[PDB]
Amino acid sequence: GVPTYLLPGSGQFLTTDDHSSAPALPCFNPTPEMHIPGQVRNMLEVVQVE
Amino acid sequence: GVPTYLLPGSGQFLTTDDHSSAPALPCFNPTPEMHIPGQVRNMLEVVQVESMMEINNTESAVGMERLKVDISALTDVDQLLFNIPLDIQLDGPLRNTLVGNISRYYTHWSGSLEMTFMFCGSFMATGKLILCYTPPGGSCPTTRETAMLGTHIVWDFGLQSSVTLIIPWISGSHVGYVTCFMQTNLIVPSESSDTCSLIGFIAAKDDFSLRLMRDSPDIG
Amino acid sequence: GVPTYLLPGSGQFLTTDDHSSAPALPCFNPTPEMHIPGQVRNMLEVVQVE
Amino acid sequence: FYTLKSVKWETGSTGWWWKLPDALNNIGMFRSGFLIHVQCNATKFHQGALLVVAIPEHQRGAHNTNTSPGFDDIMKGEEGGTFNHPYVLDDGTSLACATIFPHQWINLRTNNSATIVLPWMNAAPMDFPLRHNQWTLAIIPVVPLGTRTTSSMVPITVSIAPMCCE
Amino acid sequence: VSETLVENFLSRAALVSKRSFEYKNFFKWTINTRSFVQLRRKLELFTYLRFDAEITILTTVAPDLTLQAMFVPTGALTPEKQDSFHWQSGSNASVFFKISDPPARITIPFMCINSAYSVFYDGFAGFLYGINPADTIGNLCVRIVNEHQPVGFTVTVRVYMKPKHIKAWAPRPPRTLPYMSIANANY
Amino acid sequence: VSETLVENFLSRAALVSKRSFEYKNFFKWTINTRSFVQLRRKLELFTYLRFDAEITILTTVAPDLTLQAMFVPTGALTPEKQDSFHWQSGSNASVFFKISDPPARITIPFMCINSAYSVFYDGFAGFLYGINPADTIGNLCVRIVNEHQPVGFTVTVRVYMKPKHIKAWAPRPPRTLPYMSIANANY
Amino acid sequence: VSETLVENFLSRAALVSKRSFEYKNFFKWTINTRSFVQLRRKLELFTYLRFDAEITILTTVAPDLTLQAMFVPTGALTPEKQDSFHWQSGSNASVFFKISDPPARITIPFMCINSAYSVFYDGFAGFLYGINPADTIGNLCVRIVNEHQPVGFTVTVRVYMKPKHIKAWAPRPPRTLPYMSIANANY
């Protein structure tokens, strides 16, 4: 086995960091996408509307 | 040594995730495979097999007398015989079917169904029947003169002993009817018995799909 | 540091699994091999003897 | 290519089951590919249907008790038993879903013959034929018969032929 | 600007539920996201959107107690007594976690039958106004798994939600008057 | 569709056994899978199948107690007293785990002498109806390893089973009448 | 067949020693492998063999106690009192482990001066029958490192041995009569 040691900051819970999560229902297919008009990606497309 | 730190969610125990496990008996050989016929890999190969259904949904019918209907010559003229509500999660004529008992496990379903009827009287007997299908947006016609408006087929035992009826598909989101009508009076010879019989089959087509798995309420 | 999380089954002690072990005396030389006759490798060589 | 004793099917009849390895055991014997031919005969005036099915590993169950069945009730042998309750196949599995097994329909209007080829189906390559009932040939009358008069004989005859028994 | 994307605009990971119980005995919270008016107003700006949950359950007590948290989707039955046989069913996601460990984490994928969640539904179900039957997700039931120690317990549970993998559609003007209830949008 | 494969259809990982013991002293459970009628009916649909076990033992007590869980295959002897010399034998899989740690996990490979488990056996052994002598797997005996502290203990053990690597043969119609016993299929 | 190799035939990892001590105070066990008659008979089948030890010490108590386990090879001195200055010597392998942690593990390489261990020695040392002076390995002395808490302790130590990297020579017929002692092979 590979040796290791814990850094300070282990076991804490931030609220802003992003990590992978364990799925609840593996091998479950969501319903697929569909081209719905009016998709917005950035909020600066909102503020340019008069 | 490499440094590390524990994410939140360590040491928990889910019941659905898959991971490798430590073996109990390492370097132990199982007995090898052998080509046993009838191997199934996907459960949609099960539901495409046709199965009988309970046509005679009336009360006081116990046992294997729920699978057939009677059409006596002296009794009925221009009378409807049966109807099938197309509600698989709900009780009725389709509860004890092979397409029914699988799809109680799953909760979302969509796919085209196929129904096959079969006559079982004598060689001599003839007579006509019509099979009106009604979409869920329309009411089930209880009169024949309104029943010719919907999609129907004129079935004649005599010339043909069986019939295939394709149902257009609709998903289950939160109802459709397949009804029958006696076209003409049954005529039989003097030697054969008067009472004949019908049997209805059901089998899903290949676009039948299931999405979300749950436990079954069928068994206690 | 690399992030990680513990699977269920950590810290247990099986008796059949094989893993690497920390040596007691590192950089210690054993006495070398020598061709001793009658070496057996598999136990089916024993049962074939009448 | 052996033949069995012909049975009489009437209105009150309710089913028949043979155990294939056993029912054929008591005739001149001690990899087996079974072939089964079932043929009844009637005139054009009779009517009715059957259901010839060959259920593998069919484990029966005693009605409304806790006692497992015995040596004589299971291995009747070469006579063939009768279903006490054909609608639940004597084990609770419904007859309506029984078409998953290899089966053919004898409908007296259309035809009066059925033929099922049964291959060797066991996990072990060897089998004890005195202590194991491999297949169970079962015929079940779904729609009973009827004439103007009382019921007729309409005899049914099962013909079994193995290949490469040992 | 990497800051103002919609995938970054709704990833706050705020609290949604906090209800304790003293040693009815088990905690059942519906998954409707209209709990706090801070997060609710940020979802008023879009008509249709699509995401996943990433639930985190944080637990503090006032002791080596074990907790079970079971997720139940829509259509399946929900338990009513703590030792019911619905808890023993394995057709639903359950997680077993202690108190001394770091808190549990589980993500819930997109489970509407349409292409997106309908935040606003100008229509009726059956025959209710503003209730889409394909919108709701389910509920998570949290019980404890121990024989109760006859001492002073106070088990308080906090639930956090980080909606990620956001896609949005049809931006809408924000709400300026305060809310009346959580069933509809009165003023 | 990735959902409806047989390898995914029988991988529920449900509970099979839960029997506590108070401080006879050790827990011995047979490995027959016909414990709960929910899992038993899902195995009625197939004639022959082949899998492995992946046992998980979850333990909660009502304290730094150490537990031994020993697996015993068929043909070998099973212990009858807690301090017997069968527990000291090393020709069988044992695992030593605490309570404070995350729960133990061990998988049991396919150990029938045939090509698959025979769920239904229309035949007799020796001379029993419906008992295949090559079908059974063994049993796991769980004892504690401590001198008993003379205080109020309540050690409750839960065992979970995830059958994976499934292969199936010969689909069969499901059962509609409820069970009478677990020895056979009466009604 | 991967099952019946000699490297797989003697890798059982069984128990060899179990002797507790109550709070002389420290546990000293010789490393002779002729402890249990189950493992001893499996070593009767071969004349000369060669391996390494892989000791595992499992410790349960009836509390955050720290344990020292020191290995002493042959020729070096062994301690007689718990606080002796032989424990402070650093010319021998020592391991410091707690109770709450998972148990300690240490492997001991092949340390005979010949090419293999002589299980049977038809000869004399000096001037004893059946004692080869190059056969013995040493002994491990296990003490505790704490000031004793004046309460009821019961510290029980179990030692396991997995001989791996096996090579064997000259197979021999097994023993059928039971043993008289562990010094020789009387009957």
Automatic annotation (TrEMBL), chain D:
<comment type="function">
    <text>Lies on the inner surface of the capsid shell. After binding to the host receptor, the capsid undergoes conformational changes. Capsid protein VP4 is released, Capsid protein VP1 N-terminus is externalized, and together, they shape a pore in the host membrane through which the viral genome is translocated into the host cell cytoplasm.</text>
</comment>
<protein>
    <recommendedName>
        <fullName>Genome polyprotein</fullName>
    </recommendedName>
</protein>
<comment type="similarity">
    <text>Belongs to the picornaviruses polyprotein family.</text>
</comment>
<feature type="domain" description="Picornavirus capsid">
    <location>
        <begin position="1"/>
        <end position="145"/>
    </location>
</feature>
<comment type="subunit">
    <text>Interacts with capsid protein VP1 and capsid protein VP3 to form heterotrimeric protomers.</text>
</comment>
<comment type="function">
    <text>Component of immature procapsids, which is cleaved into capsid proteins VP4 and VP2 after maturation. Allows the capsid to remain inactive before the maturation step.</text>
</comment>
UniProtKB/TrEMBL annotation, chains E, F, G:
<comment type="function">
    <text>RNA-directed RNA polymerase: Replicates the viral genomic RNA on the surface of intracellular membranes. May form linear arrays of subunits that propagate along a strong head-to-tail interaction called interface-I. Covalently attaches UMP to a tyrosine of VPg, which is used to prime RNA synthesis. The positive stranded RNA genome is first replicated at virus induced membranous vesicles, creating a dsRNA genomic replication form. This dsRNA is then used as template to synthesize positive stranded RNA genomes. ss(+)RNA genomes are either translated, replicated or encapsidated.</text>
</comment>
<protein>
    <recommendedName>
        <fullName>Genome polyprotein</fullName>
    </recommendedName>
</protein>
<comment type="similarity">
    <text>Belongs to the picornaviruses polyprotein family.</text>
</comment>
<comment type="subunit">
    <text>Capsid protein VP1: Interacts with capsid protein VP0, and capsid protein VP3 to form heterotrimeric protomers. Five protomers subsequently associate to form pentamers which serve as building blocks for the capsid. Interacts with capsid protein VP2, capsid protein VP3 and capsid protein VP4 following cleavage of capsid protein VP0.</text>
</comment>
<comment type="function">
    <text>Protein 3CD: Involved in the viral replication complex and viral polypeptide maturation. It exhibits protease activity with a specificity and catalytic efficiency that is different from protease 3C. Protein 3CD lacks polymerase activity. Protein 3CD binds to the 5'UTR of the viral genome.</text>
</comment>
<comment type="subunit">
    <text>Interacts with capsid protein VP1 and capsid protein VP3 to form heterotrimeric protomers.</text>
</comment>
